[PDB]
Amino acid sequence: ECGEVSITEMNWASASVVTTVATFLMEQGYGCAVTVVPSSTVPAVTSVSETGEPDILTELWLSSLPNYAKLEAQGTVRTLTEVLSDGGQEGWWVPQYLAEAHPEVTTIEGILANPDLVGGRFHRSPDGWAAAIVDSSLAKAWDLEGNGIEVFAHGSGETLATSIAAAYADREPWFGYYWAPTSVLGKFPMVMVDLGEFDADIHACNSKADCANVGKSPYPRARVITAVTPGFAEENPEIIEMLSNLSFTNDQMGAILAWQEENGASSEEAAVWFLSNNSDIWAGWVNDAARENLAALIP
Ligand SMILES: C[SH](C)CCC(=O)O
């Protein structure tokens, strides 16, 4: 049967839905005993590399983890599936109204030459995200500070998101890291600053704390996966099979997030809502036994 299971909950909205839906399916469907570990990309990958826990890492954004392939080779982790099946795109953004009022902010060089247009500030992703390493590398490669752009490190994904909302309310400038599709970007039309042509080797270097030779590249489009420890896999073929199926298209994730905001729903309430209304999506994720358990508890 299924006993003790630990799973990361990453510190942003889609990630919460992912972990909450997974938890519910594991507990109700397979009688799992699930410990949700609040986490972030960097300490989470660090934690499995060192303690072989937690069992399940998700969402795992692969855009800026250049050493993940190696981790999987050494058999420290195993990729089950892309949990956001459409993927996502990270970048540096300004509000649409700003890009329309002053089109020169649509390229990084344009911004660097006229920092007042963005209020002399860049909003950096928070400590614990792989993106914080990249942004920090890019700030250096473009010499933001030297050009009068202050790199402001947000304390969390929440305060990063709120700084957009605040700026937007008053139609003020904003320049910083974010990603799409997200609720924030659906609610506040943003435009991606052109950071030049993608370069795999430059980005790999930007993604590594120890690579000093930083260069200019935008982020690649992200694959976003659920991963597990081969130990947990060996032990729980049924959960692995289920987690190999558990996945959301961006439309599906959007539809859940919206519902959770139009109500005051907890993450748990959103999960129940998704499962209750989307049998056609998830029925195939679970096995017959689990589906018996779920059929009986869900309504
Ligand atoms: C929230 S994500 C879009 C990226 C996560 C990370 O950079 O560690």
Side-chain angles (χ1 to χ4, degrees), residues 21 25 85 245-249 251-253 256 274-286 291:
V21 172
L25 289 176
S85 52
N245 290 320
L246 194 152
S247 182
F248 304 87
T249 66
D251 291 344
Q252 287 158 359
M253 178 61 61
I256 300 171
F274 165 72
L275 296 169
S276 175
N277 294 276
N278 294 277
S279 181
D280 61 302
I281 308 298
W282 66 264
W285 296 355
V286 307
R291 222 179 304 105

Side-chain angles (χ1 to χ4, degrees), residues 112 135-144 202 206 214-217:
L112 296 173
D135 287 340
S136 166
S137 291
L138 293 175
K140 201 284 184 299
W142 287 105
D143 188 23
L144 264 55
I202 295 179
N206 287 347
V214 300
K216 310 173 185 186
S217 175

Side-chain angles (χ1 to χ4, degrees), residues 12 40-42 59 61 63-64 90 125 128-132 177 179 219:
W12 54 95
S40 215
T41 304
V42 168
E59 301 172 3
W61 283 67
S63 51
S64 305
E90 293 156 288
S125 49
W129 292 11
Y177 169 96
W179 73 103
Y219 286 76

